[PDB]
C-alpha cells in the first residue's frame, strides 16, 4: 500500500535529503514523504503535527534540531500529539534524557544517545585508569539527577559509591558554597553533569578556589566543554563529545532504513490497522501502534552511515560511540575513543589539570583527624 | 587512658588530631524523634556519621 | 474577576456540576469567580488544545479544571502545555487527567486530584502493620516508577522501630523474548507470604499467569498492588488471585460534582491571596502566537498559593510535582467473585479499616490471670505490639491490646508445633465459667 | 534415627484434563528431598509439571 513516513524536520536543505532517502528506500510496498518545517512556536507546532497527518495519515514521525538554540521542548509537541494514537517518533537530534521514560513519552525512540548515558562512558573510565573515589557535581534537574541515577547503578555492579554527590540549583550565581564542602573530600576526581551555563558558574568558582591546580581531574560531559564553559574550562578538562551528533543527514538516512525495515515485517502481521486519517474523530489508540513500536526497537540495522543502529529497551542508542576531548593548549584535541564495549585511548599523551604530565593519583589522606571523646572517670 | 592510646596510634599511623568532646553528651542510640519522623544517632554515634 | 472554565469530556452531569457552581461559597476570599462550563466529546488532542486557546482568547480566562471519563494518559500530558506554555493553572480533577504523572515540566502549572507511587506505597505499609503483617517482598518490572517505589518502601522500613523484614527486591525484565524460563528463574526465589508486586496492569496478568505456572499465586499469600494494576476495577481480567489488595482512588464517593466544587474553590483562593498579598491581577496574553515574546510575564508566584490552600477545613494542598498531599484513598479487596469491594480508608495517615480480623485457623478465648494471661496496652516504643507478646482483642469497645504470660507462651510453642494459627480475644460475658440456669458462660 | 516425613501425596494418570488439577496437587511439597515412583513416561510428566 502507500504507506506514509513523513518526517517533521527543520534545515529545508536536509529535508531535501530526505526526499532522496525516501526514494532510495523504494528502490530497495512503497514510502512516501511528506516532510514539513518546524513551527517556532509551541502551541502552533503540536497542532501541525496532526494537521499534516491528515492529508498524509504517516506511520511515524522524525524531529530534528531546529533552528531555535532551545535543543529542549521541540519533540514535546511531535511526541504527545502523536503519543496519543500511539504513533512512534524518531528522536533525531536530541539528548536530554526525559525521553527516555515510556510512562510519559509512550511512543519515542531516539536514534541518539541521551546525555545521562554519558556516565556509562565514565564508569568504564574509571578501570581504566584505576578511579575509584570521585565527586558528582550533578544538578537538582531531572537531567542531573539522570547521570546521578545512573552512574550511581553502574557504580554498585561494582561494589562501590561516589564519595559525594553534591547537587546545585540550576541557574545557581554563587556555586561556592556547594564546591567548599568538596575541598575537605578526599578524592580528587570531579565529575561534572551540568549544563552549559551551569558549567560557567561551575567553573569560576573552581578557578579561585584553587580546584584547578595539579592533581585534580575533571570528568565532564559534552554540555560542558562548549558554548559559554569551554570559553572558562580550565586546561586538562577530559571531556567528551559525539562522532556525529550533530550531523542530521547521517542519522536521518539510518532512521529511515530502520523504519523501514519494520514496514516490511509490517507487511505480515494479524489484524494490521491503518493509522488515523487525521485529528477530527479518531480517538482510537491505534492497537498496531504499539506492535509498531515493539518490533522497531528489535529491529536492528545490519550496517549504516553511524554503523549499527540497535534501539535500546527504553528506545535509546545501543552500542554508540565516544569521543574523548581534551584542553590543550585551548583547543579540545581527542585522545581517545570508544568503541562501544571499552575505551581505546588515542597514542598522544594527557595533559592533566595543572600542567602535570603523568597522571594524577586523584586521592589523599587527610592525617589530620577529628576525634570525638565523652567524659568519662579512668579513661 | 583513651587520650594515652590516642597519642600512640598517632605516632605509629604518622597523623595529628584536633579532639572535642561531645555536645550532646552521649554516647549513641537510635531514636525515634517524631518531630522529624527520622532515626538518627544521638552524639558520640551521631557525629561520627 | 477570576476566569475559570471548567470543561467536561464524555457523558457527564453537566446540570448538576452547574448547579454546585451555585453553591460555591467564596464571599470571605471575594475572588469573583467566572465559571464557565464547556462539554464536549474527547475527540481529538488539536480539539483539546484548541478548545482551551481559542476560549482562552474568548475570556482571558486565569484558570482551566479539566474533567474526562476516558483512561487515555496522554490527556495529562496534553494538558501540561497549556498548564506551561500559557502559564494558565490546569486541574486534572477527574478522568484521564487525574492519572499522575511523575515528572512534569520545570514551570509547569498543572496539578492533578490523585496519589503518588510513594504515596501509595506508604499506605501499603499500613495495611500490614494494622493486621500485624511484617513479611515482606517486593517484585517489580522495568516501569520508571518501580525506583522511587522501591525506595519508599526502603526508606520507610529503616526509619521505624517496628520490626520490618524485607526478603528480596526481586525485579524482572519483560524486554527479554521467550524468557519465561528466565523470567521464571528469578520469580522462583520468592518465598514470602505477602508480595508487593508494582506493575503494569498487563504485566500483572503475566506475572500471575507465571505464578499460575508455579502456582503459588494464592493460598494463604495477601499480594498486595497499587492502583495502576487494578485500573478500571470493572473490567478484572481473572487472572488476578482472590485477595488481592489494591489501593485505588476516592473514585466510588468523589463524583465529579463534588471534585468540580473543588477545583473551582482551589484556583479562586490562589488567587485572592495573591490579589491581596502581592495585589497583582495576573492578565496575561491569551493569543497562542509567537509564545516566545510571552514569556516576560511570568505568574511563578500563583504556584506557592495553589500549593497550600485551605477548604473547608480540609488541607486541599497539592505539591511541586502536582500530586495531593492529603489525599483520600480506599483499600479496594478482590471478593469471591471477581468484584472489587472497598475495606478501607486512608486520610490524614489515618487507616479507618472495616475489617478487625483478616478473613488452619482457629479462635482462641483468653481471660486476664495474674501469671498466665497478662494484657498491656498498645506498646508505645514502636508501636503494636512488642516481643513476647501477642495481639488480643476485648469487647465491652474493640480494643486491640497486647497479651503476654505463661499460658500465652504455651500456645506460641504449640502454635508452631501443630502448625495453626489463631486469634485470641478476652471475655466480656464473664470469667472462666459457671452454669447459670443451665447455661454457660466465660471461656468455656 | 531422626527421620521425618512431609508428604506421601499421590497423583492420578488416567484422569482426563489433570493437569491443573496435578500442578494444584504438587503445592503441596515443600521439602528438599524428593523421593519419586512413577514410570519413566509419566517421570517426564511430572519433571515437566514440576518444571
New interface residues.
Given amino acids: 500500500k502507500i504507506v506514509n513516513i513523513g518526517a517533521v524536520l527543520s534545515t529545508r536543505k536536509h529535508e531535501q535529503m530526505f526526499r532522496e532517502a525516501v526514494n532510495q528506500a523504494n528502490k530497495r510496498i512503497q514510502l512516501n514523504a511528506t516532510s514539513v518545517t518546524h513551527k517556532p512556536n509551541a502551541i502552533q507546532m503540536a497542532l501541525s503535527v496532526c494537521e499534516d497527518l491528515i492529508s498524509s495519515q504517516v506511520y511515524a514521525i522524525l524531529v530534528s534540531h531546529p533552528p531555535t538554540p532551545n535543543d529542549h521542548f521541540t519533540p514535546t509537541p511531535v511526541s504527545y500529539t502523536a503519543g496519543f494514537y500511539r504513533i512512534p517518533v524518531l528522536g533525531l537530534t536530541t539528548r536530554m534524557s526525559i525521553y527516555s521514560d515510556k510512562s510519559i513519552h509512550l511512543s519515542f525512540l531516539r536514534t541518539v544517545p541521551p546525555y545521562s548515558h554519558q556516565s556509562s562512558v565514565w564508569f568504564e573510565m574509571m578501570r581504566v585508569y584505576s578511579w575509584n573515589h570521585i565527586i558528582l557535581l550533578v544538578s537538582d534537574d531531572h537531567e542531573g539527577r539522570a547521570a546521578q541515577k545512573r552512574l550511581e547503578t553502574l557504580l554498585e555492579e561494582r561494589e562501590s559509591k561516589a564519595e559525594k554527590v553534591l547537587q546545585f540549583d540550576p541557574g545557581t550565581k554563587n556555586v561556592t558554597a556547594l564546591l567548599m564542602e568538596a575541598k575537605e573530600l578526599e578524592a580528587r576526581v570531579i565529575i561534572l553533569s551540568a549544563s552549559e551555563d551551569d558549567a560557567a558558574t561551575v567553573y569560576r568558582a573552581a578557578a579561585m578556589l584553587n580546584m584547578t591546580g595539579s592533581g585534580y581531574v575533571w570528568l565532564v560531559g559534552e554540555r560542558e566543554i562548549s558554548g559559554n564553559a569551554l570559553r572558562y574550562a580550565p586546561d586538562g578538562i577530559l571531556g567528551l563529545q559525539l562522532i556525529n551528533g550533530k550531523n542530521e543527514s547521517a542519522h536521518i538516512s539510518d532512521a529511515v532504513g530502520v523504519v523501514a525495515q519494520a514496514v516490511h515485517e509490517l507487511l505480515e502481521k494479524e489484524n494490521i490497522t491503518d493509522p488515523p486519517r487525521g485529528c477530527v474523530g479518531n480517538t482510537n489508540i491505534w492497537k498496531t501502534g504499539p506492535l509498531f513500536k515493539r518490533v522497531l526497537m528489535s529491529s536492528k540495522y545490519a550496517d549504516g552511515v553511524t554503523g549499527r543502529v540497535e534501539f535500546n529497551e527504553d528506545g535509546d542508542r545501543k552500542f554508540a560511540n565516544y569521543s574523548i576531548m581534551n584542553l590543550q593548549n585551548r583547543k579540545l584535541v581527542q585522545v581517545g575513543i570508544y568503541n562501544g564495549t571499552h575505551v581505546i585511548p588515542n597514542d598522544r599523551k594527557i595533559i592533566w589539570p595543572g600542567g602535570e604530565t603523568e597522571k594524577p593519583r586523584g586521592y589523599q589522606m587527610s592525617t589530620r583527624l577529628k576525634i570525638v571523646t565523652i567524659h568519662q572517670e579512668p579513661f | 587512658?583513651?587520650?594515652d592510646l590516642?597519642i600512640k596510634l598517632a605516632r605509629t599511623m604518622?597523623?595529628?588530631?584536633?579532639?572535642?568532646?561531645?555536645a550532646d553528651?552521649?554516647?549513641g542510640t537510635?531514636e525515634?524523634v517524631n518531630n522529624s519522623?527520622?532515626?538518627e544517632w544521638n552524639?558520640?554515634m551521631g557525629?561520627?556519621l | 474577576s477570576i476566569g475559570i472554565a471548567v470543561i467536561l469530556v464524555g457523558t457527564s452531569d453537566e446540570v448538576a456540576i452547574k448547579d454546585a457552581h451555585e453553591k460555591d461559597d467564596f464571599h470571605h476570599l471575594s475572588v469573583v469567580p467566572r465559571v464557565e462550563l464547556v462539554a464536549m466529546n474527547e475527540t481529538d488532542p488539536k480539539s483539546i488544545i484548541t478548545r482551551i486557546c481559542d476560549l482562552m482568547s474568548d475570556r482571558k480566562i486565569q484558570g482551566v479544571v479539566f474533567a474526562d471519563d476516558t483512561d487515555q494518559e496522554a490527556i495529562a500530558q496534553i494538558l501540561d502545555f497549556i498548564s506551561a506554555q500559557t502559564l494558565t493553572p490546569i486541574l486534572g480533577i477527574h478522568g484521564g487527567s487525574s492519572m499522575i504523572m511523575a515528572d512534569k515540566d520545570e514551570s509547569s502549572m498543572f496539578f492533578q486530584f490523585g496519589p503518588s507511587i510513594e504515596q501509595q506505597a506508604s499506605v501499603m505499609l499500613n495495611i500490614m502493620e494494622e493486621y500485624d503483617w511484617y513479611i515482606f517482598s517486593i517484585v517489580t518490572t522495568y516501569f520508571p516508577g518501580y525506583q522511587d517505589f522501591v525506595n519508599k518502601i526502603r526508606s520507610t522500613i529503616e526509619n521505624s522501630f517496628v520490626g520490618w523484614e524485607l526478603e528480596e527486591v526481586l525485579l524482572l525484565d519483560m524486554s527479554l523474548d521467550d524468557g519465561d524460563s528466565k523470567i521464571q528463574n528469578q520469580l522462583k526465589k520468592l518465598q514470602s507470604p505477602i508480595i508487593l508486586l508494582y506493575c503494569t496492569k498487563e504485566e500483572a496478568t503475566y506475572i500471575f499467569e507465571v505464578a499460575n505456572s508455579v502456582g503459588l499465586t494464592g493460598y494463604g499469600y495477601t499480594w498486595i498492588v497499587p492502583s495502576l494494576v487494578a485500573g478500571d476495577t470493572d473490567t478484572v481480567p481473572a487472572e488476578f488471585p482472590t485477595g488481592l489488595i489494591s489501593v485505588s482512588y476516592d473514585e466510588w464517593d468523589y463524583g465529579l460534582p463534588a471534585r468540580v466544587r473543588d477545583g473551582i474553590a482551589i484556583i479562586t483562593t490562589a488567587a485572592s491571596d495573591m490579589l491581596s498579598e502581592h495585589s497583582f491581577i495576573p492578565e496575561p496574553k491569551s493569543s497562542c502566537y509567537n509564545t516566545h515574546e510571552k514569556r516576560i510575564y511570568q505568574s511563578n508566584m500563583l504556584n506557592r498559593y495553589l500549593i497550600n490552600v485551605t477548604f473547608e477545613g480540609r488541607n486541599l494542598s497539592f505539591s511541586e510535582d502536582g500530586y495531593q498531599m492529603h489525599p483520600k484513598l480506599v483499600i479496594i479487596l478482590l471478593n469471591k467473585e471477581r468484584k472489587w469491594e472497598r475495606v478501607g480508608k486512608w486520610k490524614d495517615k489515618s487507616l479507618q479499616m472495616k475489617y478487625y480480623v483478616w478473613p488452619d485457623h482457629l479462635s482462641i478465648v483468653t481471660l486476664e490471670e495474674a501469671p498466665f494471661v497478662i494484657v498491656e496496652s498498645v506498646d508505645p516504643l514502636s508501636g503494636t505490639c512488642m516481643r513476647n507478646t501477642v495481639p488480643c482483642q476485648k469487647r465491652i469497645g474493640y480494643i486491640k491490646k497486647c497479651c503476654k504470660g505463661f499460658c500465652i507462651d504455651i500456645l506460641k510453642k504449640i502454635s508452631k508445633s501443630v502448625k495453626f494459627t489463631y486469634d485470641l480475644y478476652l471475655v466480656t460475658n464473664g470469667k472462666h465459667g459457671k452454669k447459670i440456669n443451665g447455661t454457660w458462660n466465660g471461656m468455656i
Fill in positions: 587512658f583513651c587520650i590516642l604518622n597523623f595529628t588530631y584536633e579532639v572535642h568532646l561531645v553528651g552521649k554516647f537510635q525515634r519522623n527520622k532515626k552524639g558520640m557525629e561520627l
